[PDB]
Design an enzyme around this catalytic site. Structure first.
Site, PDB file in Angstrom:
ATOM      1  N   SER A  51       6.937   4.329  19.581  1.00 37.67           N
ATOM      2  CA  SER A  51       6.868   5.756  19.194  1.00 37.67           C
ATOM      3  C   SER A  51       6.992   5.839  17.679  1.00 37.67           C
ATOM      4  O   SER A  51       6.608   4.871  16.998  1.00 37.67           O
ATOM      5  CB  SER A  51       7.908   6.579  19.911  1.00 37.67           C
ATOM      6  OG  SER A  51       7.457   6.961  21.202  1.00 37.67           O
ATOM      7  N   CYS A  55       6.859   9.903  21.085  1.00 38.43           N
ATOM      8  CA  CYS A  55       8.227  10.433  21.173  1.00 38.43           C
ATOM      9  C   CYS A  55       8.788  10.299  19.766  1.00 38.43           C
ATOM     10  O   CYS A  55       8.008  10.477  18.812  1.00 38.43           O
ATOM     11  CB  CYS A  55       8.987   9.584  22.179  1.00 38.43           C
ATOM     12  SG  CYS A  55      10.370  10.425  22.973  1.00 38.43           S
ATOM     13  N   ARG A  56      10.072   9.961  19.669  1.00 38.07           N
ATOM     14  CA  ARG A  56      10.669   9.204  18.538  1.00 38.07           C
ATOM     15  C   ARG A  56      10.729   7.728  18.960  1.00 38.07           C
ATOM     16  O   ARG A  56      10.333   6.851  18.139  1.00 38.07           O
ATOM     17  CB  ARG A  56      12.048   9.781  18.182  1.00 38.07           C
ATOM     18  CG  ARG A  56      13.129   8.739  17.912  1.00 38.07           C
ATOM     19  CD  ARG A  56      13.086   8.198  16.495  1.00 38.07           C
ATOM     20  NE  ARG A  56      13.888   9.043  15.627  1.00 38.07           N
ATOM     21  CZ  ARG A  56      14.965   8.656  14.953  1.00 38.07           C
ATOM     22  NH1 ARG A  56      15.373   7.399  14.981  1.00 38.07           N
ATOM     23  NH2 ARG A  56      15.631   9.540  14.233  1.00 38.07           N
ATOM     24  N   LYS A  57      11.160   7.488  20.210  1.00 38.04           N
ATOM     25  CA  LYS A  57      11.636   6.169  20.710  1.00 38.04           C
ATOM     26  C   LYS A  57      10.984   5.822  22.059  1.00 38.04           C
ATOM     27  O   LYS A  57      11.006   4.630  22.458  1.00 38.04           O
ATOM     28  CB  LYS A  57      13.169   6.201  20.747  1.00 38.04           C
ATOM     29  CG  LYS A  57      13.809   7.508  21.209  1.00 38.04           C
ATOM     30  CD  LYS A  57      15.336   7.518  21.106  1.00 38.04           C
ATOM     31  CE  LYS A  57      15.936   8.855  21.501  1.00 38.04           C
ATOM     32  NZ  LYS A  57      17.415   8.866  21.408  1.00 38.04           N
ATOM     33  N   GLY A  58      10.415   6.818  22.730  1.00 40.25           N
ATOM     34  CA  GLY A  58       9.489   6.614  23.854  1.00 40.25           C
ATOM     35  C   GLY A  58      10.161   7.014  25.144  1.00 40.25           C
ATOM     36  O   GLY A  58      10.193   6.194  26.075  1.00 40.25           O
ATOM     37  N   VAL A  59      10.673   8.244  25.183  1.00 38.99           N
ATOM     38  CA  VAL A  59      11.681   8.690  26.183  1.00 38.99           C
ATOM     39  C   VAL A  59      11.333  10.098  26.657  1.00 38.99           C
ATOM     40  O   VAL A  59      11.123  10.251  27.861  1.00 38.99           O
ATOM     41  CB  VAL A  59      13.104   8.624  25.594  1.00 38.99           C
ATOM     42  CG1 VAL A  59      14.152   9.157  26.570  1.00 38.99           C
ATOM     43  CG2 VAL A  59      13.460   7.214  25.133  1.00 38.99           C
ATOM     44  N   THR A  60      11.333  11.082  25.753  1.00 35.99           N
ATOM     45  CA  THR A  60      10.946  12.485  26.054  1.00 35.99           C
ATOM     46  C   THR A  60       9.421  12.552  26.113  1.00 35.99           C
ATOM     47  O   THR A  60       8.900  13.612  26.502  1.00 35.99           O
ATOM     48  CB  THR A  60      11.491  13.501  25.042  1.00 35.99           C
ATOM     49  OG1 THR A  60      10.830  13.361  23.785  1.00 35.99           O
ATOM     50  CG2 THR A  60      12.980  13.381  24.824  1.00 35.99           C
ATOM     51  N   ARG A 107       9.877  18.580  13.574  1.00 35.43           N
ATOM     52  CA  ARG A 107       9.777  17.146  13.172  1.00 35.43           C
ATOM     53  C   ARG A 107       8.328  16.617  13.279  1.00 35.43           C
ATOM     54  O   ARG A 107       7.946  15.771  12.438  1.00 35.43           O
ATOM     55  CB  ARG A 107      10.739  16.335  14.047  1.00 35.43           C
ATOM     56  CG  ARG A 107      12.176  16.834  14.026  1.00 35.43           C
ATOM     57  CD  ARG A 107      12.887  16.405  15.294  1.00 35.43           C
ATOM     58  NE  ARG A 107      13.013  14.951  15.414  1.00 35.43           N
ATOM     59  CZ  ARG A 107      13.303  14.294  16.542  1.00 35.43           C
ATOM     60  NH1 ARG A 107      13.487  14.954  17.675  1.00 35.43           N
ATOM     61  NH2 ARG A 107      13.399  12.976  16.540  1.00 35.43           N
TER      62      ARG A 107
END
Length: 290
Positions: free
Chosen positions: A271, A244-249, A183
């Site tokens: 993210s 991230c995508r969303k700000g998590v990993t 991705r």
């Protein structure tokens, strides 16, 4: 002077087995999973660390917002970790029973930090290894007397769309995308999304979060981590943001960076979902569509 970021199941076990849990020690299951896969709230309610409360990320977030995984108000946070009987004098131990070993708990470890709270640690090897040694689990409802939480936003850990776009030219901050390579490149699609291409931001180096975790679910020796970074021509001496995508990993890099001795990795919480939607197309790239 960095506090314990990780604790062992053995440590948590011995702690639980000693009624150390309570206003001094509070355990959280942060588990969240893509709709139609697993159900953490259920799985939590069925078995959880004796005296564990379930951290729900859908409820502790900025719901007004139109982007994935936005921080709540210092208020929304303080009120929430309040009702989970967590003062600012307490020590917070965060887990999720994600397969890999961890996924959300570092999001929460962070959140707790970015709100001016330094006694928080992730439980190392997730709920996964907690079970893998059969450490007592329960269905019995954890019901902690609510506590008052002073919540102070440390801004240095939080990078906003505006600040990332600046750094696009400034280059003063190293930019890491924790997303899976597929991705970061644009090969794979973006899941649970409508008209959201895959592709990373001009300058992003890809360090997928999977690669911070041994087969067994534990985080890696800091030597292995310290390699992992260097090898990605990523310098810990130098200012570093995590997307991230969303700000998590992204927090997974934060935890890594921290363990190695860098407690100044900020997190782009917008993210990719925010970036994708707000940014001009030129500030971001994808193998495929151009």
């Amino acid at each position: 002077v960095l506090y314990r970021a990780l604790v062992s199941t053995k440590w948590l076990a011995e702690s639980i087995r000693t009624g150390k849990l309570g206003p001094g020690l509070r355990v959280l299951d942060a588990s969240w999973y893509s709709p139609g896969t697993r159900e953490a709230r259920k799985e939590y309610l069925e078995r959880h660390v004796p005296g564990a409360s379930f951290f729900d990320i859908e409820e502790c977030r900025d719901t007004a917002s139109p982007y994935e995984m936005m921080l709540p108000s210092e208020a929304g946070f303080a009120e929430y970790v309040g009702r989970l009987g967590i003062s600012n004098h307490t020590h917070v131990v965060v887990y999720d029973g994600e397969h890999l070993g961890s996924f959300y708990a570092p999001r929460v470890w962070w959140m707790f930090r970015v709100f001016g709270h330094r006694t928080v640690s992730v439980l190392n090897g997730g709920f996964r290894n907690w079970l893998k040694e059969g450490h007592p689990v329960t269905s019995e409802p954890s019901r902690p007397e609510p506590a008052v939480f002073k919540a102070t936003l440390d801004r240095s850990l939080l990078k906003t769309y505006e600040q990332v776009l600046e750094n696009l030219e400034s280059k003063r901050f190293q930019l890491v995308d924790s997303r899976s390579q597929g991705r970061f490149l644009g090969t794979e699609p973006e899941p649970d999304a409508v008209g959201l291409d895959s592709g990373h931001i001009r300058g992003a180096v890809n360090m997928p979060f999977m690669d911070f975790l041994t087969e067994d679910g534990f985080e890696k020796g800091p030597e292995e981590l310290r390699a992992l970074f260097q090898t990605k021509k990523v310098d810990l001496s130098q200012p570093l943001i995590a997307t991230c995508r969303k700000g998590v990993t992204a927090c997974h890099v934060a935890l890594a960076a921290y363990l190695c001795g860098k407690p100044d990795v900020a997190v782009y919480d917008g993210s990719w979902s925010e970036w994708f939607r707000r940014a001009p197309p030129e500030s971001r790239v994808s193998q495929g569509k151009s």
